[PDB]
Nucleic acid binder design. Structure first.
Ligand SMILES: [Mg+2]
Ligand SMILES: [Zn+2]
Lengths: 68, 36, 56, 125, 71, 99, 53, 69
RNA sequence: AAUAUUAUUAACUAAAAUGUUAUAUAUAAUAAUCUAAGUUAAUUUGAAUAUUAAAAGUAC
């Protein structure tokens, strides 16, 4: 959501459409180190669930690759 | 000397001792008799 | 002897007209821009040499 | 006279929140023992950073000296130095603290800079 | 007794009420014609850090403090 | 008692009056339908089972000599969930024909 | 480079001085006047457990 | 400056300040602007800053008039 | 009381609720495009100093 908000809001700080890109990509310059979720695992969030879904008729039938 | 920390579940059990003690004192503040 | 506070006969619990001066050094949130300033991006100040030189 | 090792023990936390008459002040945050020579070093180092035209440094030395060698046994919240104005010059916090910053290192225990009037010890501590 | 607990329990524990008869428990009687409003319990989980990603806020947030281990 | 009178006459039956009052004067005065409690015997919670079950529906009369223990026993009652409590002294329920 | 005790004791002394990351260790580099370089004192870039705590 | 010394230098009336301030406009094309009553204070305050004592101001009274109560 | 001296230690067979480990560690969010001058080079200290040598800092 946030990056889409960054895209559709006007360009006052940085260059759009131009090939310069004032802020240059520097992945190696950034933080190299492990966070506590790199050890203990990704933080637990509630599993995404479907409430009150209608019962699965045709549960025995297989879906055809839908290219048709 | 005591060197390594107390594990977490030990002091959890100690907390349980605390509110066991408290559970006792609530009983102790109840009246001597009851009018029925 | 046991010691206990008097009741409240009149007026507020926390002294209003009797306030002690608060002991921090009083730097305004907008005078020193650091944090706690929630300013809508429409209202952003002090751009006089950057974007507020070409206003509206 | 001929006081034992346990005497005038600084270790308690005091109830007196000091009142500093000077515009700014330097106040003991911990317990400890301070030598006179350390406070003299602090005083000189602070007098280097003062505008002697507008200001005067007041040092509170009137506390008892305890045998070790004679030094001071300081409780939390005991004021040490005071910046007193001779004129309308009003320092900020950054400036006053920048001034006391010179003399802080010579003092062996932690100190806080406090503004005129009574120590607000809710904010300091 | 009509008074719960012993004397030792009474002067240990501020739960058991004062059993004073003809006076109000707290000073003189309250007038007949909210502590948490001023008491702050807000537990701050993550300690707020110092803004190194901004040059001016870095130096304006300066803490003038000297680390001292107890002697 | 231009209100209280019809309240205590025929509005219901009753044992409605808890008197917390000295044993000396309850022999002198006596109101002979009231349950004679002790004010300590109320606050303590030793009277709870004889006090009525439904907490909201009840309204109880505290009959006290010194009004200070009337005010004490009111709080004693609302501690156990009795909010409607009316403080009455002896002479009041004389005109109400309750004695 | 001089090693400051912690991040708070770290200041930008010049116009050209920058904050940079040396593998999770925060440091200050000036492309001009290298004597302004400051490291936060912290663990070595390579450390084992028994070797470094 | 006064605190540097502890005594004022020469007395001056606000009459003189106007004929100092008359001479410096913003734009000689239009002498009226900026207005004297405002920009005089710049002169007054700079003289102030110089250590000049004043009459209208910084002393309670105005220089005596011979002929009037 | 009367007398005598002194400078952790598990029958046997089972049951049994108290061992394992909570390790130091915090990131994203600056490369930072745009601009004429105008009390004023205040005054003092200084050979000089004009916001940035010292002094003095509630003039406007
Ligand atoms: Mg200069
Ligand atoms: Zn540098």
């Amino acid at each position: 959501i946030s990056e889409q908000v960054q895209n559709r809001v006007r360009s006052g700080k940085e260059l759009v459409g131009t090939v310069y890109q004032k802020a240059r990509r520097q992945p190696w310059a950034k933080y190299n180190g492990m966070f506590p979720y790199d050890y203990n695992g990704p933080a637990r969030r509630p599993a995404a669930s479907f409430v009150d879904a209608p019962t699965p008729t045709h549960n025995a039938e297989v879906c055809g690759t839908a290219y048709a | 000397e005591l060197l390594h920390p107390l594990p977490v579940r030990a002091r959890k059990m100690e907390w349980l001792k605390r509110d066991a003690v408290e559970e006792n004192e609530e009983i102790l503040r109840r009246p001597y008799y009851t009018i029925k | 002897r046991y010691y206990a506070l008097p009741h409240l006969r009149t007026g507020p619990p926390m002294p209003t007209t009797l306030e002690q001066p608060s002991g921090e050094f009083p730097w305004g949130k907008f005078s020193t821009m650091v944090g706690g300033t929630r300013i809508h991006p429409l209202y952003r100040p002090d751009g006089f040499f950057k974007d507020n030189m070409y206003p509206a | 006279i001929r006081q034992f090792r346990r005497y005038g023990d600084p270790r308690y936390i005091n109830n007196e929140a000091a009142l500093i008459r000077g515009q700014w002040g330097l106040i003991t945050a911990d317990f400890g023992m301070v030598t006179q020579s350390q406070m003299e070093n602090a005083r000189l180092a602070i007098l280097r950073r003062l505008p002697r035209g507008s200001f005067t440094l007041t040092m509170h030395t009137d506390y008892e000296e305890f045998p070790v060698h004679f030094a001071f046994k300081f409780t939390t919240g005991v004021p040490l130095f005071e910046i007193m104005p001779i004129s309308a010059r009003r320092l900020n916090q950054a400036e006053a603290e920048g001034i006391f910053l010179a003399g802080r290192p010579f003092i062996p225990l932690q100190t806080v800079v406090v503004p005129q009037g009574r120590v607000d010890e809710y904010h300091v501590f | 007794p009509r008074i719960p607990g012993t004397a030792e329990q009474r002067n240990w524990d501020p739960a058991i009420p004062l059993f004073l008869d003809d006076v109000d428990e707290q000073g003189r009687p309250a007038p007949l014609r909210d502590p948490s409003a001023f008491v702050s319990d807000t537990v701050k989980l993550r300690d707020d850090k110092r803004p190194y990603w901004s040059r001016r806020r870095w130096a304006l947030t300066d803490k003038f403090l000297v680390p001292k281990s107890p002697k | 008692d231009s209100h209280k009178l019809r309240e205590k006459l025929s509005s219901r039956k009753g044992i409605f009056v808890i008197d917390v009052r000295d044993p000396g004067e309850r022999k002198l005065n006596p109101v002979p339908r009231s349950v004679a409690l002790h004010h300590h015997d109320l606050l303590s919670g030793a009277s709870c089972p004889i006090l009525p079950q439904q907490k909201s529906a009840a309204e109880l009369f505290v009959l006290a000599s010194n009004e200070s223990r009337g005010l004490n026993s009111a709080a004693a009652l609302r501690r156990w969930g009795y909010d409607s409590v009316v403080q009455v002294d002896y002479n009041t329920l004389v005109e109400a024909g309750y004695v | 480079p001089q090693m400051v005790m912690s991040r708070d004791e770290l200041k930008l002394r010049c116009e050209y001085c920058r904050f940079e990351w040396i593998h999770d260790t925060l440091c200050v580099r000036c492309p001009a006047q290298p004597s302004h370089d400051q490291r936060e004192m912290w663990l070595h870039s390579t450390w084992m457990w028994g070797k470094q705590q | 400056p006064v605190p540097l010394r502890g005594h004022y230098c020469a007395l001056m009336t606000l009459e003189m300040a106007y004929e100092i301030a008359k001479m410096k406009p913003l734009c000689w094309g239009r002498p009226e602007y900026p207005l004297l009553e405002t920009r005089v204070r710049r002169v007054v305050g700079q003289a102030r800053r110089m250590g000049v004592c004043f009459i209208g101001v910084d002393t309670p009274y105005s220089s005596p008039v011979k002929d009037m109560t």
